[PDB]
Amino acid sequence: LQRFENCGIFIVMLEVILKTLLRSTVVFIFLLLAFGLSFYILLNLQDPFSSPLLSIIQTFSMMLGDINYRESFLEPYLRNELAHPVLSFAQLVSFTIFVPIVLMNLLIGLAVGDI
Amino acid sequence: ILVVNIKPGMAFNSTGIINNSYLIKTCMILVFLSSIFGYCKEISNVLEWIIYTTGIIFVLPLFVEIPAHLQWQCGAIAVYFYWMNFLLYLQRFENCGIFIVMLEVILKTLLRSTVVFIFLLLAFGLSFYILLNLQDPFSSPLLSIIQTFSMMLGDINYRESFLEPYLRNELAHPVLSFAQLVSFTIFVPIVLMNLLIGLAVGDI
């Protein structure tokens, strides 16, 4: 579709935003490895965080702002099942600041420029 | 290595788990040596004073018997800051440093604006604490604030906390509760989140 006169600008733009993200990702893999290996300590008793690689695929799926808050922090806290409740809620506000707010707006800001 | 090879919360010594010993022993000796070398070489200056002090506690059972819960409490803190502080080493590579310079600009701009908008979330937090008090998520004034903070990304929990309680006749103030819900959705997920996208788009 790069050779049709309504389409090709969108495939040229798709490749610009994709090549920029695929450069950016070498940096921000370590930003998600930080929260992934840390929620693997604090939330270990819960199915989504059962293993270090499942913990990373879950932290990646929280990046779009679907944190699973009630299901994974609040309800375990009211059952007395969080092993580190204060430190778990601190890492939740920290994750929400650095990843869904900061990192996602940095990718919107990059895309707005490059388009 | 010492995180992925030992189950979180189990106490461990040079002999392995208190219940891989060569891997466990050598990786502890390395974390200890590199933390005391770190104390010699001593926001970057603050991150090191979290990392080397906390990384010592995770490994004190190399020499000193210490509680399982305290060992992993420091394991969680140390492992997190070790990787956040690993980004500061990417400032000096030609593919990367542009993104760490941009990450700091958007983060410093956000952390200035929070002085203002902490009171915007305290308004809705102390107010949903009145109107929704009978529901588990809003049971306490601090739980109510951690809950409106989690609603900020646009996951309002609408059916679960307004509609279903209303159809059961369990909202204590239904009209005023639905007004505060449209108000929250306007000021926070729409207005405040777009103000942070607008700031980020400019400053990048």
Side-chain angles (χ1 to χ4, degrees):
Chain A
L1 304 184
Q2 286 198 293
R3 317 300 176 232
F4 291 124
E5 232 191 4
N6 303 330
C7 303
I9 192 172
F10 299 112
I11 296 86
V12 169
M13 288 182 299
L14 191 86
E15 181 152 308
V16 168
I17 187 180
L18 185 71
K19 283 176 176 286
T20 304
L21 174 63
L22 272 53
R23 276 179 166 268
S24 202
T25 199
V26 80
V27 183
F28 305 120
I29 277 287
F30 301 114
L31 181 59
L32 277 86
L33 201 68
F35 289 112
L37 278 291
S38 193
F39 288 133
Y40 174 59
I41 314 311
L42 300 171
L43 306 175
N44 191 37
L45 302 177
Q46 306 186 31
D47 294 320
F49 306 99
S50 298
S51 300
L53 182 61
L54 289 181
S55 191
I56 297 159
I57 301 163
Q58 171 63 117
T59 298
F60 173 82
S61 191
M62 295 158 68
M63 187 204 295
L64 275 37
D66 194 359
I67 323 298
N68 293 85
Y69 169 68
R70 292 193 181 175
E71 192 171 38
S72 326
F73 299 86
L74 176 76
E75 292 166 9
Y77 172 68
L78 297 174
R79 295 191 309 256
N80 300 81
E81 293 176 7
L82 296 185
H84 306 101
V86 173
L87 193 64
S88 185
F89 285 116
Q91 204 71 296
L92 186 274
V93 61
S94 306
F95 174 88
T96 304
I97 284 171
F98 278 87
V99 184
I101 301 172
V102 161
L103 186 72
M104 293 297 295
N105 288 359
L106 181 142
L107 291 182
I108 295 160
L110 280 168
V112 164
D114 305 333
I115 285 168
Chain B
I1 289 173
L2 199 61
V3 175
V4 308
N5 286 282
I6 303 176
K7 194 174 185 178
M10 281 287 183
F12 63 90
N13 281 136
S14 55
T15 58
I17 303 186
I18 303 183
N19 196 309
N20 291 307
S21 171
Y22 185 82
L23 172 142
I24 289 173
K25 177 182 170 75
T26 52
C27 291
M28 278 205 293
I29 290 164
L30 289 168
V31 168
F32 187 83
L33 260 59
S34 198
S35 302
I36 68 174
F37 299 159
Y39 181 91
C40 299
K41 190 158 68 175
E42 277 295 320
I43 191 156
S44 182
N45 299 292
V46 188
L47 297 181
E48 301 277 289
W49 275 101
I50 299 163
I51 288 162
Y52 301 132
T53 61
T54 305
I56 285 287
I57 297 165
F58 185 58
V59 170
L60 270 170
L62 187 63
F63 305 117
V64 175
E65 181 267 300
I66 255 160
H69 185 265
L70 171 59
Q71 191 177 14
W72 283 94
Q73 187 181 338
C74 289
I77 292 171
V79 174
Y80 169 64
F81 281 118
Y82 253 113
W83 286 111
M84 295 295 284
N85 187 71
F86 189 69
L87 293 178
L88 270 41
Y89 293 74
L90 305 186
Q91 287 208 263
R92 290 178 288 256
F93 294 118
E94 176 171 283
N95 297 316
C96 299
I98 177 62
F99 300 112
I100 297 85
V101 170
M102 289 182 302
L103 194 85
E104 175 159 313
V105 169
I106 188 179
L107 184 69
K108 284 180 174 291
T109 302
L110 171 63
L111 271 50
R112 280 178 169 270
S113 79
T114 59
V115 178
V116 183
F117 305 123
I118 199 73
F119 300 113
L120 181 61
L121 279 87
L122 200 69
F124 289 112
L126 277 290
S127 185
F128 288 131
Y129 174 59
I130 314 310
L131 300 170
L132 306 174
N133 192 34
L134 303 180
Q135 304 184 31
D136 295 320
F138 305 101
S139 299
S140 304
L142 184 61
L143 289 181
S144 189
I145 297 159
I146 300 164
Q147 172 63 121
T148 63
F149 174 80
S150 193
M151 293 162 65
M152 188 204 294
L153 276 35
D155 194 357
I156 299 303
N157 296 86
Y158 169 69
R159 293 191 181 173
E160 195 170 36
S161 276
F162 298 85
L163 176 77
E164 292 163 14
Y166 173 66
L167 297 174
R168 296 192 312 258
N169 298 76
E170 294 179 13
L171 297 185
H173 307 99
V175 172
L176 194 64
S177 185
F178 285 116
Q180 192 67 341
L181 190 275
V182 61
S183 305
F184 177 91
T185 304
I186 284 171
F187 276 88
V188 184
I190 301 172
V191 160
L192 186 72
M193 293 297 295
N194 287 356
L195 182 145
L196 291 181
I197 295 160
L199 261 40
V201 165
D203 305 349
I204 284 167

